[PDB]
Design an enzyme around this catalytic site. Structure first.
Site, PDB file in Angstrom:
ATOM      1  N   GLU A  23       0.921  -1.096  -0.104  1.00 48.27           N
ATOM      2  CA  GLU A  23      -0.204  -0.105  -0.051  1.00 48.27           C
ATOM      3  C   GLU A  23       0.863   1.454   0.072  1.00 48.27           C
ATOM      4  O   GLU A  23       2.118   1.285   0.409  1.00 48.27           O
ATOM      5  CB  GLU A  23      -0.976   0.114   1.243  1.00 48.27           C
ATOM      6  CG  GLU A  23      -0.026   0.159   2.663  1.00 48.27           C
ATOM      7  CD  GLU A  23      -0.841   0.169   3.657  1.00 48.27           C
ATOM      8  OE1 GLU A  23      -1.967  -0.157   3.884  1.00 48.27           O
ATOM      9  OE2 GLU A  23      -0.508   0.986   4.800  1.00 48.27           O
ATOM     10  N   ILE A 141       8.543 -10.089  -3.735  1.00 41.50           N
ATOM     11  CA  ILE A 141       8.621  -9.153  -2.135  1.00 41.50           C
ATOM     12  C   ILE A 141       9.843  -8.202  -2.402  1.00 41.50           C
ATOM     13  O   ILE A 141      10.926  -8.663  -2.875  1.00 41.50           O
ATOM     14  CB  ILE A 141       8.966 -10.516  -1.355  1.00 41.50           C
ATOM     15  CG1 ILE A 141       7.694 -11.020  -0.960  1.00 41.50           C
ATOM     16  CG2 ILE A 141       9.565  -9.624   0.037  1.00 41.50           C
ATOM     17  CD1 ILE A 141       7.981 -12.325  -0.092  1.00 41.50           C
ATOM     18  N   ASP A 180      13.230   7.259  -7.773  1.00 41.20           N
ATOM     19  CA  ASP A 180      12.785   7.073  -6.454  1.00 41.20           C
ATOM     20  C   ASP A 180      12.936   5.669  -6.354  1.00 41.20           C
ATOM     21  O   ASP A 180      12.022   4.751  -5.663  1.00 41.20           O
ATOM     22  CB  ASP A 180      11.400   7.246  -6.556  1.00 41.20           C
ATOM     23  CG  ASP A 180      10.955   7.443  -5.003  1.00 41.20           C
ATOM     24  OD1 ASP A 180      11.696   7.546  -4.113  1.00 41.20           O
ATOM     25  OD2 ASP A 180       9.783   7.457  -4.503  1.00 41.20           O
TER      26      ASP A 180
END
Ligand SMILES: COCCOc1ccc2cc1OCC(=O)N(C)CCCNCc1c[nH]c3ncnc(c13)N2
Length: 329
Positions: A23, A141, A180
């Site tokens: 999220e 992951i 980023d």
């Protein structure tokens, strides 16, 4: 031509198999299964007047650049002169209208109970709400979550090499800067391939996988161009982005601004080198490995990554690094 119900992207069985995997303010990500295969579904509420997770919702116009970048990078996997699979593959994009599905609310709750959320429970959306639903390949992951889970610095080196090649291919093809690439944005999943393949300006090579395939995600700040049309996030007026502390990550924003003189439309591939340096710094100082460097070949790998950390900032691009740095020979 016109938005679809959630059922178009997420029919019942796919909804029933959703589990939340991540999220942020401007996105919720779920893993599900289609044709026996994992996929990642990112959902973003758009165009509405309500605050969501403390911020206004993106308009279609504000989110479109990030979707364009996704597509362009994904397409690199089927190119010839400049080919890489190292960006997250984009399967589909829909504009959906409806209330949040109750089955998704159930997956949201589970994640909140087990990991904790900083987001609002997405239960207050009305049946006129618009969303963008993106289906991506499942990337595994993130590196941060794998902090204590990798075999050895041999694995670290494969990751850095994968990341450097993917960014070089994107520099060469699209004058790409990620901007980023913190360690939440590097995804790791198992592969049975011993070697991974890329092509940079027509010259193909391979990278030993060490049993992992890396995927790059999240184009919030990213920049690229085609035929002189530049897609980028203009942060020249942001203040907060440049005043963070407590992690080298936050110096990287400042160092990019220094490199580009606060002109974010320009192409400064040195920003990719800055991020790769941050990632190398994480490998050496924050990651901890199951097997330490104990054999000749392993200690050499350790010394080479150390040498990469102190030398890479004298290269001008990921392209320069990939083609000239001794770590990759
Ligand atoms: C406009 O969209 C541009 C594309 O940006 C993304 C594509 C795929 C993403 C995440 C993307 O942006 C960041 C974001 O929305 N977060 C919620 C933060 C990170 C969550 N990752 C969780 C994650 C784990 N396994 C995954 N396999 C594939 N994709 C994933 C994830 N996430």
């Amino acid at each position: 031509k016109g938005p679809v119900p959630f059922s178009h992207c997420l029919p019942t069985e796919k909804l029933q198999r959703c589990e939340k995997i991540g999220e942020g303010v401007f996105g919720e990500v779920f893993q599900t299964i289609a044709d026996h295969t994992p996929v990642a579904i990112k959902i973003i509420a758009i165009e509405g007047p309500d605050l969501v997770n403390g911020s206004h919702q993106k308009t279609f116009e504000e989110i479109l650049p990030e979707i364009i970048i996704s597509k362009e990078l994904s397409l690199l996997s089927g190119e010839v002169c400049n080919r890489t699979e190292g960006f997250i593959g984009l399967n589909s994009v829909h504009c959906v209208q409806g209330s949040y599905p109750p089955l998704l609310l159930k997956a949201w709750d589970h994640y909140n109970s087990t990991k904790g959320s900083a987001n609002d429970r997405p239960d207050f959306f009305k049946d006129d709400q618009l969303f963008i639903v993106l289906e991506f390949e499942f990337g595994g992951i993130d590196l941060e979550q794998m902090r204590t889970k990798l075999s050895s610095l041999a694995t670290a080196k494969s990751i850095l090499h994968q990341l450097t090649a993917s960014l070089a291919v994107a520099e060469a093809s699209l004058r790409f800067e990620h901007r980023d690439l913190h360690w939440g944005n590097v995804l790791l999943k198992k592969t049975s391939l011993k070697k991974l393949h890329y092509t940079l300006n027509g010259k193909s090579s391979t990278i030993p996988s060490c049993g992992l395939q890396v995927s790059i995600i999240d184009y919030t700040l990213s920049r690229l161009e085609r035929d002189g049309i530049v897609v980028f996030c203009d942060v020249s007026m942001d203040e907060d982005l440049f005043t963070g502390d407590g992690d080298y990550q936050f110096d990287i924003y400042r160092l990019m601004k220094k490199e580009n003189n606060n002109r974010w439309g320009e192409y400064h591939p040195y920003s990719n080198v800055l991020w790769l340096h941050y990632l190398t710094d994480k490998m050496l100082k924050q990651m901890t490995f199951k097997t330490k460097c104990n054999t000749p070949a392993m200690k050499q790998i350790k010394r080479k990554i150390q040498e990469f950390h102190r030398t890479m900032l004298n290269f001008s691009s990921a392209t320069d690094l990939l083609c000239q740095h001794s770590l990759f020979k």
